[PDB]
Design a protein around this ligand. Sequence first.
Ligand code: CO
Ligand code: CO
Ligand code: CO
Ligand code: CO
Ligand code: CO
Ligand code: CO
Lengths: 449, 449
Amino acid sequence: TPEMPVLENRAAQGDITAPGGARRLTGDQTAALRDSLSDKPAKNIILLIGDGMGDSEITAARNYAEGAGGFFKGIDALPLTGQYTHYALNKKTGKPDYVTDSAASATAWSTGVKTYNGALGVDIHEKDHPTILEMAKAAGLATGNVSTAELQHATPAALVAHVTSRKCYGPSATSEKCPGNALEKGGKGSITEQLLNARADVTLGGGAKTFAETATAGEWQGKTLREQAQARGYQLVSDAASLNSVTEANQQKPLLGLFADGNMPVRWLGPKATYHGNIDKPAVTCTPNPQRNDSVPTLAQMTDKAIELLSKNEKGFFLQVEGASIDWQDHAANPCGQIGETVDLDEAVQRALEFAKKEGNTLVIVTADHAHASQIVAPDTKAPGLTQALNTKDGAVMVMSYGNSEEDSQEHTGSQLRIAAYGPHAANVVGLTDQTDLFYTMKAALGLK
Amino acid sequence: TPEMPVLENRAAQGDITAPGGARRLTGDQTAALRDSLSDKPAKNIILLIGDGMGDSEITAARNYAEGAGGFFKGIDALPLTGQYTHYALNKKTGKPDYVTDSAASATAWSTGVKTYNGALGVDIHEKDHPTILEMAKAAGLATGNVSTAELQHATPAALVAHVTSRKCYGPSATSEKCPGNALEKGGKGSITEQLLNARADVTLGGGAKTFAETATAGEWQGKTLREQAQARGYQLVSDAASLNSVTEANQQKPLLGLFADGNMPVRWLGPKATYHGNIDKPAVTCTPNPQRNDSVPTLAQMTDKAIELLSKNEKGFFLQVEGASIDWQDHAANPCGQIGETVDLDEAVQRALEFAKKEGNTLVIVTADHAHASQIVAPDTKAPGLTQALNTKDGAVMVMSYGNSEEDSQEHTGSQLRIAAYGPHAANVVGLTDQTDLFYTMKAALGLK
Ligand SMILES: [Co+2]
Ligand SMILES: [Co+2]
Ligand SMILES: [Co+2]
Ligand SMILES: [Co+2]
Ligand SMILES: [Co+2]
Ligand SMILES: [Co+2]
């Protein structure tokens, strides 16, 4: 009977065409919300990020996978909610830049300082700031960094690398685009070199491609980054079997799961949206990606396994899980890809809430780094961008529009967006907050001195 | 100090380029939120609707008028927040229609039943359902209905009229489009005729034009609707000074303020966004509309006057206030008009919160009927639709994009959106809810049975 309740059912209660049939509430919530408030310490924190998962992305995925009156048992089940701002800074002027990229936003919640687009773990003066994961490890807590994206990708890379440009994946890119970060120039090195130095306990995702690179200097000069990883004691897994037979993860044998050369496989496939696609082409039903595999751990599986391995630390743990390709698919104007990745994240959120509700001292937060392009529009819409009609769980058509770029990729947008939480200190996400407040919220809930 | 706190400040606390400077919080919110939870009765309710005011609209307006790290002392200050769904229904199938218009959404929170786009006060079978305003009046509470739109517009009209199409403004359009509701055919009459019957204690807004039409039947056949109101005991006012002179409003002497022929004047002027407007043109600075006026009451003034007149009822009151032109200007791809109307709504929200914190038993809710088109995008965006660069309070450029219609009007979008509240029973807007839950939340808070 976990004192702090997870919402069990906020689907429409009945017949949506009848008075009250679309209500998601069965009665007053004052007592349940009083019950969801505690300022006791967070022993653990699990932060899940849906990259580019603004309210529009949440709504479109729900409409399609669960119906308009449906309910995500993970994403929609956190009882304390608010909206936060994620604007970045113009590097030269220090004024706001209203639409952040992935790097500046992830720098914001992981360091508590606003920065310029493309920066990771540094401010507009290129000065390094400690990340919540670096700080959690320093305090003796176990640390996890999970993502379906390549690990050099901004979201999980911000927790372990401090570079002046997110493009500095390896020695090569670094020496070129982050000259002062390049190892052979006295800096701390490429994103992957600093990730190896950071040494979290559990690091799972894709991005094996960069590890085939060789250090230009340093103790492991000439050796490949994977060679360097093997040499520094890391426990390297590459598939679901090898990951599941892992029984422990610590500093002596930190875990590095490289499940793909680049990003991990998307869950669902569909045609890309097109000009007047909702008018000129048939409504679409998403299809399961045949190449996604029971040999590749799902986000939910990587989450569960990271939780099992991190919860053995009695001091506690900090874990960040990213459903990364929601952003990727929204950029590609591919509704099916995008929605399937939201559905993927919801399964990981359910594993987190199921663990937190039993454990009792776990603060779980679900949010996104920034908003995105996709909009849900009327079925008859004639829009200038890319559109597509989808057959939803309701047996009705929903049309999605991508209308903010004539270029190859659709763009991020600056709208404030949902952040939701459950457990100790979850009140700190309610109302209007800033993305940097989340750093302070996590740091304080863990009591990191 | 009335135990329930209104947020005093959620702006960035310091230098946004420094660690912690972008924080909107100054410490833990658990105690603050516990103090914001009460399940005692709401003696009064003030519902403020920004038409089309989704999170994107709130953010764009805050970024322009208050700076990225600024704070809307009204809109951003409600402590309990959540996200609600506003889908309508397809009339024929009864399945969800993912993008509602203003009529079906206002019908949903005012009656508690989902309906089809364009319906007012009736369900998909065209059955009338009592509204929260009619129920309040039936229980002896005073009632107010305020809007900057013409009063026949969907948002205020849904509280007092039951017609099969929102276009049925007066006798002529009702005869043509809602034959079943036409007075000469045995129906309840046009929107304006039903509004005159509903007899709220205070009704203020635009829409004088339709009152020049004459009734086709009934006791006032052949007389204009304005002559009808006069003969029925209404006190008619048409400007700021006549409204100010009003001393009481009740069933014997109900107040009807008609301040414009159509919609009331927008607060700010600016050019319409254009194709590649952010590449091809210089940035826009909004400017006050000369056509505003000390002779035209502002939304904040109409809100205050309504509060003063309705609070003389010892049993309590229900008041809806609509900032209407946010929607009109978002459809017109006019950033300045759109933002100025959000600033306008923020002032009315402040008046409502100021009253509520002092009174202690008033539930204030602030939300929108549906989301809209506008998106905040990167300055160098090259988009297919209409865009505009704007000079914000920060001394930086923000670019807005309207990209969902090649047609003249930009359109509504289906994303769930913010709903926020303050006062008794405010917990009921937190987490995921449906727009129809708002009807039940209001009914229960006032203890209407
Ligand atoms: Co991102
Ligand atoms: Co990411
Ligand atoms: Co992106
Ligand atoms: Co509307
Ligand atoms: Co309206
Ligand atoms: Co509209």
